[PDB]
Amino acid sequence: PITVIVSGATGFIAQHVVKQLLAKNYQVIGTVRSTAKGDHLLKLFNNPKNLSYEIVEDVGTKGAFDKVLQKHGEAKVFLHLASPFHFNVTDVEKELLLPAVDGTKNVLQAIYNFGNNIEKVVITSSYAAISTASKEADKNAIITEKDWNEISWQDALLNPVNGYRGSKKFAEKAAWDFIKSNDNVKFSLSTINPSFVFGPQSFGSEIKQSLNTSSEIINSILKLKPNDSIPASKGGWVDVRDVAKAHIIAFENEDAKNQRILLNSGRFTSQSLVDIINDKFPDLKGKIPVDPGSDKSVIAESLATIDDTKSRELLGFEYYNLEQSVYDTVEQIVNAHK
Numbered sequence: 001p002i003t004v005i006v007s008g009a010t011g012f013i014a015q016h017v018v019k020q021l022l023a024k025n026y027q028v029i030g031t032v033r034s035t036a037k038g039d040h041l042l043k044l045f046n047n048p049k050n051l052s053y054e055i056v057e058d059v060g061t062k063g064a065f066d067k068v069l070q071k072h073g074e075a076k077v078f079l080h081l082a083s084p085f086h087f088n089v090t091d092v093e094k095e096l097l098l099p100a101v102d103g104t105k106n107v108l109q110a111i112y113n114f115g116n117n118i119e120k121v122v123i124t125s126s127y128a129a130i131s132t133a134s135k136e137a138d139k140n141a142i143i144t145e146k147d148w149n150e151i152s153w154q155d156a157l158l159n160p161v162n163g164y165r166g167s168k169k170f171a172e173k174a175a176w177d178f179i180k181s182n183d184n185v186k187f188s189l190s191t192i193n194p195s196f197v198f199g200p201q202s203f204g205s206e207i208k209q210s211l212n213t214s215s216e217i218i219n220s221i222l223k224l225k226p227n228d229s230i231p232a233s234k235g236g237w238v239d240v241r242d243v244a245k246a247h248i249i250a251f252e253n254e255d256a257k258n259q260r261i262l263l264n265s266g267r268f269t270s271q272s273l274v275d276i277i278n279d280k281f282p283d284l285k286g287k288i289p290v291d292p293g294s295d296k297s298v299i300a301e302s303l304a305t306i307d308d309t310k311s312r313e314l315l316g317f318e319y320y321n322l323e324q325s326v327y328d329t330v331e332q333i334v335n336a337h338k
């Protein structure tokens with residue numbers, strides 16, 4: 001017996017976290033937006049005895065997790081995954097910022113009140129909350145877990161990218177500020193800060209033409225045409241399966257108490273992804289562009305070093321690499337259209 005609450009459980013990472021949690025025989029209560037969502041989640045796993053679901057139509061509102069904490073006082077672990085990953089933002093602070101910040105409070109306020117036997121808590125943040133624009137481009141720099149993105153609130157408002165990056169920064173700020181501004185904090189907080197999350201969905205069932213994931217970075221490649229220009233993008237990446245695992249080690253492991261945990265397997269550009277696909281998918285070579293080896297040089301010259309040694313030590317397992325992650329992503333999308 002050992003109960004774990006996971007919010008927004010139909011999400012890309014969360015669904016992996018759920019699979020792995022269930023495989024280690026935890027009891028899992030996931031929250032979902034709708035009744036439809038919930039019943040779909042249970043059917044995907046063929047209704048195990050150790051998996052239930054509660055409905056939180058909006059994780060951000062005041063008291064959003066009030067009923068479930070009171071109805072499930074046996075739980076000890078809270079994994080928070082839900083956050084608007086995109087919208088069509090007409091106003092950053094209304095649509096995006098203040099939700100992330102005043103919403104993260106209305107999760108922790110809910111737990112400080114009614115999460116009585118809750119001991120370990122894990123929030124999913126981002127590498128975008130760690131790295132600053134100027135630093136991330138410094139080839140000579142070394143960004144670690146202590147680094148904070150120094151973006152202003154006024155800067156977060158300029159556009160939706162600054163918006164999203166700002167939401168991550170100010171929301172995780174709020175989460176530590178909470179455990180410092182309250183007295184008998186009965187739980188400990190760990191945080192998972194990934195770069196771009198690649199990898200397959202938990203179930204090939206769920207594949208749609210455009211994946212509501214950062215694996216749309218990859219998918220966008222497959223919608224290119226041979227004579228098309230390759231859209232520039234780059235940064236760190238990590239596999240959804242290692243990210244999900246990290247969330248579990250975050251409360252299983254005691255050294256994880258009060259830790260920011262950087263999740264990053266390596267670095268990519270779009271050339272990296274093209275190369276890997278053309279190389280390993282013969283039924284696609286000649287149906288998308290080229291220019292091989294660009295990445296190596298671009299990465300060496302235009303990106304800092306992510307030093308996540310302290311994170312990779314704490315976690316202690318080995319990561320998927322780019323070839324395998326990209327492969328599993330694409331192999332899954334191919335074998336879904338038919």
Ligand SMILES: NC(=O)C1=CN([C@@H]2O[C@H](COP(=O)(O)OP(=O)(O)OC[C@H]3O[C@@H](n4cnc5c(N)ncnc54)[C@H](OP(=O)(O)O)[C@@H]3O)[C@@H](O)[C@H]2O)C=CC1
Nearest residue numbers: 008010011012013033058059082083084085126196197214
């Ligand atoms: N994905 C990446 O590459 C990166 C991810 N992150 C972090 O990863 C976390 C998980 O996103 P991911 O799982 O990666 O991809 P998803 O976008 O698939 O996760 C989205 C999930 O969050 C739920 N959700 C979002 N806002 C609300 C809300 N206001 N009320 C209720 N449910 C909500 C959705 O519910 P429904 O599906 O029912 O609408 C969905 O299940 C995010 O919090 C983000 O900060 C950080 C850096 C990069």
